[PDB]
Amino acid sequence: SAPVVGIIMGSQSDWETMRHADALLTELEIPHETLIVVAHRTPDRLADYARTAAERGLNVIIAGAGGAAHLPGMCAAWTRLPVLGVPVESRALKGMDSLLSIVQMPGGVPVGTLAIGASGAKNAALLAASILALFNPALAARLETWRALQTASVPNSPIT
Amino acid sequence: SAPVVGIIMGSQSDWETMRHADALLTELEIPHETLIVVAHRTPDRLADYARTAAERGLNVIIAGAGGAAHLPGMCAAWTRLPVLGVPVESRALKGMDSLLSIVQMPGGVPVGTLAIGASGAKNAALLAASILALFNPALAARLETWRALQTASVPNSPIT
Amino acid sequence: SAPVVGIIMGSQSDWETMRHADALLTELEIPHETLIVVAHRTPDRLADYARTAAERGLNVIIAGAGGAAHLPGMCAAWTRLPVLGVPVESRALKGMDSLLSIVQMPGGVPVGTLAIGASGAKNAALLAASILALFNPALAARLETWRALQTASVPNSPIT
Amino acid sequence: SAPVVGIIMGSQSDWETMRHADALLTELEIPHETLIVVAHRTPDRLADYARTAAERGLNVIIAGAGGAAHLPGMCAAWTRLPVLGVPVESRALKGMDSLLSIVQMPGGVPVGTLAIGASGAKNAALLAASILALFNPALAARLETWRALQTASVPNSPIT
Amino acid sequence: SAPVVGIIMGSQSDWETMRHADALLTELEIPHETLIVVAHRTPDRLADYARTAAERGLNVIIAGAGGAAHLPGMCAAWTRLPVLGVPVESRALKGMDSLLSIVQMPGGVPVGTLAIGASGAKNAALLAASILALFNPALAARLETWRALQTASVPNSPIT
Amino acid sequence: SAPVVGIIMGSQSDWETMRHADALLTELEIPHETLIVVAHRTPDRLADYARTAAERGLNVIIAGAGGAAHLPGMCAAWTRLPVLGVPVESRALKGMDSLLSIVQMPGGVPVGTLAIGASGAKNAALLAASILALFNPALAARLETWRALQTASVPNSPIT
Amino acid sequence: SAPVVGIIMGSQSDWETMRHADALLTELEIPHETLIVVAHRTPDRLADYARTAAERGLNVIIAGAGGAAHLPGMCAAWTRLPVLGVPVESRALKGMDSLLSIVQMPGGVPVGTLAIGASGAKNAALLAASILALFNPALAARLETWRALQTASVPNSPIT
Amino acid sequence: SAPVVGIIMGSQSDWETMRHADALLTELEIPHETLIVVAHRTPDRLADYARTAAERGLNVIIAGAGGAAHLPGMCAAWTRLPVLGVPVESRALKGMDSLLSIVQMPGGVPVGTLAIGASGAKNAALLAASILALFNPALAARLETWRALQTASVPNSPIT
């Protein structure tokens, strides 16, 4: 089935983080595509990917990158689709450079930013699902079930 | 008509920031409500607001707060709707506390976070618009126009 | 004997830190309970725990969490008991996100915050003990003995 | 009547911040004393103040200081009473130095730390009140009223 | 004569900073152009500007932006010319976001980064001059004079 | 052949980082020299190296250091050549001290600064190459080929 | 009489800060000289100043600078005298750049660093006085008096 | 021979860092003592140590501690001797809490602060030596020899 979410990332090394977004979309049965798009090495590829995303049937883009992380913001510059950004943890600055380079978008072009690292990747997929659930009743029911199960599955006390 | 976005904020002082979200939704003719909901001072108000949001017809919640900013995250805890978080600039730490307390959500409950301050409030409204545009064609066209005008209106050189 | 301190934490992974609070309360013979309460996954459980704490006979709540650490602050929103917060060390940001999301409570709802990590957990228990000692003479004597022994046990010079 | 909370601060300049603690204790009719005690300039005054606090009838000490802020921690070193620390906003580093030098106490000697600035001073007083309320029923009722009024007085919408 | 340095910036507000680069190039009689090019609002303008810079006779590009500052890096992505980046001071984070989003470029696409603010803009122009001086002897002599005057003009004592 | 780029560093421990600059210059067939120059232990050596660099035929200096990293800035004080600075990652502060001590040059004496660590060293060499390419056609062709190959070599999707 | 402390600073703007060192030395009747010496603009002046300081009869150098602050460290590189460093508050980063670039000296060449700003300038002068007092009995007595007056003059309560 | 420098530290775990100060003093034949003094556990021991240091013949105190590092500052409060502070690296915050709690002394009571960790400990000993060398000619000659050897021992190029 045709992808409705695009997961894009700046490097193979980003996959260790972005795979959590991929896994969650699959769990919720959301058709998606997963690609490498390098903002600084393939900027024309980025422009083409972002500007054709809507006509290709994508509804949400999840973009992950680290360091001077320009991929999510430049994607949002070229699409009117919602773009969600995942700061990938960097070696020296522990993803603080990733976080600030993604979340601090000047007014006019948004990127909905999630936590540094694997939690952020999981949550980008969940946020994408909650967006799609607004106009996809079957997915909305699956998501409600997922959230309810998460709540019900919490233990009462730690293993001491 | 009935609101489809809720803008909520933790204090009157936050309005100086969140008014930019309100103005943008109004510009795009997106029906919305603008309220004060305080995580720490009105926690039952918050629970009720978030848990009933979907049944009231809300599709997106935009939540702004500063300092130890818990309003967006606790809102997300009680709703399946997408929650967008605006870190309000705090006096001492300039919204770095706001930013980290909003963006660093554990996996399982997302908050799509925007920039510290007025830019973030404006972008939360634009991100909400891009979400709604996925299933509202008239709005999608108005958002296209908005983004086109933003792009086209940029001068070629500074006034010196 | 009935608990007079509640130790609550956001995850099993928090136990590695919060166990130091548990150990210290036991050492000083302070009856307590130890539970997992997840702010974002079980927000109604949190509300019920906090709002019934006083009537259940609890006098102090020690709450530990990491990342976007909302558990201590939201607990304090629902109880008039003193709430002590322990920032649990996070992977990327080394507990700085934990610290700011706990200590920077806006005026009106306090959380008495301790150091990041195991030291903070130990000190939360000690601070709880010093609070209870104000109206429990036997505990006050045990605590005085404990502090005096700590002082007397310091070596004069390092092992060189 | 005899003071049961001591508010101490490192300079006249700190009074701009610590006056918020003083005002809150007065509002709740908690007898207190408000003094200047300087860790670095009057260290013997500090030692004497802290070591005699309990025998003078003090139950809680609230201590505020900025920069390399040692006043709360050294106070805690000489008393078994709970010590609450208020990081005062410093000129250059905006109280981040104040915050880390107060909150990061080694295990064995706690300081319950509140937010940087006026919010922290107000919350230190409220935290002191919640501690005293555990064994003072009339005060507990006044604190209940205070918190109820704070909750109830929050408007539903901002003034625009 | 035809410009050999391009000064580009993300907004009219950035001109307050980038005017210092413009003034320095003018002082050294280096032909240049001064333009607004916005990474997020005019991304096609940016691509065209950078990709044609060399064929238009530009030798160095100086790019200034604030916040999630992507302009220098994306410029460097589309040109083989040296790109110098000026972090503009942002309101909340004082250009720390600007700095990290510019300097932390992944290996393969450089941006030579200067200090936050006016100093960085002036130094980007001086660095551009030092680059051009390598193959322009008249300019090299004017730059020698400029640096000599800067050194010689320093007073021996402050005015008190 | 005579060196046209000087790579200098503050310690043998810096070589682990600076070797990436050396490797890249060699790959692009740029003659260079590689030396240790310690700002604080051999300050006269530094002065002599920098002030004679131009007459010795050097065109660019790449300087790497960590901690209180003064080598690049003091080199630039004594030469009119472009100086590029590489912040070497430090143990405690992860190169943040290195970065700020290099990039924050006051106006009047520039250092073109690259990313913390190995990426910065690689990019300093690439930036040096792009500078030399402005007046060396054979190198300009080699660099264009290098950048084109880098772009062409990017995979389309991650190894999943 | 002949100066025994040198106060040096990187600009006229630094005088707003370093005047506090000058005032303190004057108060204690310590002969001193107050000069502008710029690490980056007058590096030969710096070398000459530091290398001849001891033979000129100087015993301590107090050096203040902001930003990438290299003046104290390079001074220490050329003298065996104790060098005390004052981080001047910078516009964007509030002297955090100043602080790290001064305090993080590699082993082998020390700079005794004081607080950011006016407090640091005053304390550098006091630290210089405490050094000189070790072998100057009249000064030691005046310093005793100074510290005694500082301690004694602290009021017991704030003016409200 | 009677000690003229006191090395004090807050814990046995600090010895791993402070041993570098001890080693350097011994190398330069400076008689010294090495002790554990815990600011928060043995505050009276601290007061007695500091206030009797001068009469005991100490000339310089080197104090190391981590976290909320109050030992150097409280030592300086009780002595007129120069106090040098070594920030010991902490687990979570990498010695940034140590650094700020030591260097940011308010005006009136100085601590000459060295780098975080082993470099700072070595440099505290060297700074102490340079202070003592002002009135001890034999030590001054040993120190000059030491600095000259350090300069002469620097290699010309890295091992490649």
PDB file of C-alpha atoms in Angstrom, chain H residues 49-111:
ATOM      1  CA  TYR H  49      41.769  24.545  59.972  1.00  0.00           C
ATOM      2  CA  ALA H  50      41.297  27.765  58.021  1.00  0.00           C
ATOM      3  CA  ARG H  51      41.396  30.208  60.938  1.00  0.00           C
ATOM      4  CA  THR H  52      44.610  28.713  62.380  1.00  0.00           C
ATOM      5  CA  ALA H  53      46.397  28.197  59.049  1.00  0.00           C
ATOM      6  CA  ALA H  54      48.432  31.434  59.114  1.00  0.00           C
ATOM      7  CA  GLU H  55      49.595  31.049  62.724  1.00  0.00           C
ATOM      8  CA  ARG H  56      50.575  27.450  61.933  1.00  0.00           C
ATOM      9  CA  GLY H  57      52.911  28.790  59.253  1.00  0.00           C
ATOM     10  CA  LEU H  58      50.909  27.943  56.142  1.00  0.00           C
ATOM     11  CA  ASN H  59      51.244  30.464  53.328  1.00  0.00           C
ATOM     12  CA  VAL H  60      48.882  29.033  50.694  1.00  0.00           C
ATOM     13  CA  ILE H  61      45.877  26.707  50.826  1.00  0.00           C
ATOM     14  CA  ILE H  62      44.978  24.504  47.854  1.00  0.00           C
ATOM     15  CA  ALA H  63      41.404  23.193  48.230  1.00  0.00           C
ATOM     16  CA  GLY H  64      39.682  20.696  45.946  1.00  0.00           C
ATOM     17  CA  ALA H  65      36.049  19.592  45.898  1.00  0.00           C
ATOM     18  CA  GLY H  66      33.282  18.562  43.515  1.00  0.00           C
ATOM     19  CA  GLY H  67      29.557  19.065  43.062  1.00  0.00           C
ATOM     20  CA  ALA H  68      28.271  21.776  45.374  1.00  0.00           C
ATOM     21  CA  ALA H  69      31.901  22.555  46.097  1.00  0.00           C
ATOM     22  CA  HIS H  70      31.928  24.839  49.119  1.00  0.00           C
ATOM     23  CA  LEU H  71      35.255  23.869  50.691  1.00  0.00           C
ATOM     24  CA  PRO H  72      37.498  26.421  48.930  1.00  0.00           C
ATOM     25  CA  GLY H  73      35.152  29.361  49.458  1.00  0.00           C
ATOM     26  CA  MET H  74      34.431  28.648  53.114  1.00  0.00           C
ATOM     27  CA  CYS H  75      38.163  28.184  53.730  1.00  0.00           C
ATOM     28  CA  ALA H  76      38.794  31.638  52.234  1.00  0.00           C
ATOM     29  CA  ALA H  77      36.063  33.079  54.498  1.00  0.00           C
ATOM     30  CA  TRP H  78      38.149  32.134  57.566  1.00  0.00           C
ATOM     31  CA  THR H  79      41.691  32.912  56.393  1.00  0.00           C
ATOM     32  CA  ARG H  80      43.537  35.886  54.956  1.00  0.00           C
ATOM     33  CA  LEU H  81      45.911  33.521  53.160  1.00  0.00           C
ATOM     34  CA  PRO H  82      45.505  33.052  49.413  1.00  0.00           C
ATOM     35  CA  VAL H  83      43.188  30.117  48.739  1.00  0.00           C
ATOM     36  CA  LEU H  84      43.418  28.292  45.411  1.00  0.00           C
ATOM     37  CA  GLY H  85      40.470  26.161  44.312  1.00  0.00           C
ATOM     38  CA  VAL H  86      40.450  22.995  42.206  1.00  0.00           C
ATOM     39  CA  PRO H  87      37.069  21.959  40.753  1.00  0.00           C
ATOM     40  CA  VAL H  88      36.937  18.154  40.926  1.00  0.00           C
ATOM     41  CA  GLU H  89      35.118  16.514  38.024  1.00  0.00           C
ATOM     42  CA  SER H  90      31.621  15.348  39.017  1.00  0.00           C
ATOM     43  CA  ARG H  91      29.740  12.411  37.481  1.00  0.00           C
ATOM     44  CA  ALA H  92      26.606  13.996  35.995  1.00  0.00           C
ATOM     45  CA  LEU H  93      27.664  17.586  35.275  1.00  0.00           C
ATOM     46  CA  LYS H  94      31.346  16.914  34.450  1.00  0.00           C
ATOM     47  CA  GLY H  95      32.609  19.416  36.993  1.00  0.00           C
ATOM     48  CA  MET H  96      30.522  22.372  35.766  1.00  0.00           C
ATOM     49  CA  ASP H  97      28.742  22.416  39.116  1.00  0.00           C
ATOM     50  CA  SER H  98      32.178  22.187  40.792  1.00  0.00           C
ATOM     51  CA  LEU H  99      33.536  25.037  38.673  1.00  0.00           C
ATOM     52  CA  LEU H 100      30.665  27.470  39.165  1.00  0.00           C
ATOM     53  CA  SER H 101      30.419  26.784  42.906  1.00  0.00           C
ATOM     54  CA  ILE H 102      34.128  27.637  43.287  1.00  0.00           C
ATOM     55  CA  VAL H 103      34.914  30.405  40.813  1.00  0.00           C
ATOM     56  CA  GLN H 104      31.795  32.563  41.211  1.00  0.00           C
ATOM     57  CA  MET H 105      32.752  33.978  44.638  1.00  0.00           C
ATOM     58  CA  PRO H 106      30.987  37.297  45.357  1.00  0.00           C
ATOM     59  CA  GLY H 107      33.268  40.303  45.663  1.00  0.00           C
ATOM     60  CA  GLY H 108      35.138  40.505  48.963  1.00  0.00           C
ATOM     61  CA  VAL H 109      36.387  36.937  49.420  1.00  0.00           C
ATOM     62  CA  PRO H 110      38.552  35.501  46.609  1.00  0.00           C
ATOM     63  CA  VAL H 111      39.336  31.993  45.483  1.00  0.00           C
TER      64      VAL H 111
END
